[PDB]
Amino acid sequence: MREYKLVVLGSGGVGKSALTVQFVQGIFVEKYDPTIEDSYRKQVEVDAQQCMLEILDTAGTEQMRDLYMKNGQGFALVYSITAQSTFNDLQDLREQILRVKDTDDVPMILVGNKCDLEDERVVGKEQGQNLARQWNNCAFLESSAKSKINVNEIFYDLVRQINR
């Protein structure tokens, strides 16, 4: 069984932990507990193969960030459509990863979370698709940790990008 090192990045409060816990454990984490550093393991099937996923759930408010990108194989870059600042911060992240990896060929996906809070949206969908296209046609998804929308597809897509 092949092992995949995935890293969930993003600013604080976007829902990195909720997305990770929903995917691994099938639970929606409600109470906001700032993450120091959490690692999860999960066996999935991607394209008729069993894949052991090691998912790193990172802190959004301080940086050991360079070690994450040196070691990570794929990167989920998460923002909240509720908070404009978290969208603005992902630009620095995308460029830091390309610097540490010394290449633009890095498995990566742009994730707009909290798509269940439509009546609280601040970042439009088109602006997320616009940014992904700017990022060399990077993969893009809108997701919700509660409603279980595009949760598994985040990690599945990174696995495929690593395999290609």
Place this chain on the structure above:
Amino acid sequence: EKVRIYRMDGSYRSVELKHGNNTTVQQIMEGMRLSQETQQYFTIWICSENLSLQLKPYHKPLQHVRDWPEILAELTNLDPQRETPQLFLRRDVRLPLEVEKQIEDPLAILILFDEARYNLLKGFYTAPDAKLITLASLLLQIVYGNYESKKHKQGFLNEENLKSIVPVTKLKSKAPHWTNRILHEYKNLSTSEGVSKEMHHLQRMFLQNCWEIPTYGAAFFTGQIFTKNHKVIPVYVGVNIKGLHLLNMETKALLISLKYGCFMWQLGDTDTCFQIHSMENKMSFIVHTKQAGLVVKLLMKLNGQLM
């Protein structure tokens, strides 16, 4: 200051250490993402390769990590250079089976499920082939999802996939003959619409089949017994809420299992051994181990919990 608190599957959660290495188990327990319901079932253990100790709420786990080479020398004859400890969140050994049987919290269930799965795959669960096959089939549903004739009927349950669902002690000799019975029960699980496919429901089914295993929830210690030329037999000593169990250290075979009330114990004066008297058997045996003081104290506390 922070520490990684691991679980049996390799995952971990980093927790802030408010009081440095003076931080207690209770304080670390608060630093997890556990409600009061989830919390009461588990505690912090300190474990290296061949020594695992349940810690108490007032204990300072980082000082035990610091003092680990001295703890190994006191309780074992192990080599301290290959035993770096780590901290784990595991089931409380004192957890009564009646309390666990009514748990409905999904997080507590999966934490118990993963530990139970770890003990099964390592060979610490002794059970008839029917029970093992049933557990393996539930793991296939939990891990691989619904049964599909296209994917699982043939050329699927190789030893690579068998490792994940059967004990390592049965992988070679006995499990390859089980693949047909395993796949049948697996197919029965997926097609039986009366069996809930909720993840926490499936994990509870797995646990239900583990609760009747004699060594379920047991804390394991290491020791030696001499056979009636006297020969040395290294043994695992398992102590749980049901009683005492002796495993051959090499084969994990269940040498003897004794329920509370059907045997007595006596700590040796030297503290490096303890004697067991099987009531209604006339049989006695002595286990040599530098963990004898811990085993007897735990035996007293778990026997005393019963009504």
